[PDB]
Design a protein around this ligand. Structure first.
Ligand code: BGC
Length: 13
């Protein structure tokens, strides 16, 4: 299992 957690989509610059 891996709970990726970062909203849904990564908040990069
Ligand atoms: C999730 O993906 C959307 C795609 O538009 C982006 O705007 C969000 O900032 C990101 O977390």
């Amino acid at each position: 299992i891996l709970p990726w957690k970062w909203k849904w989509t990564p908040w990069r610059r």
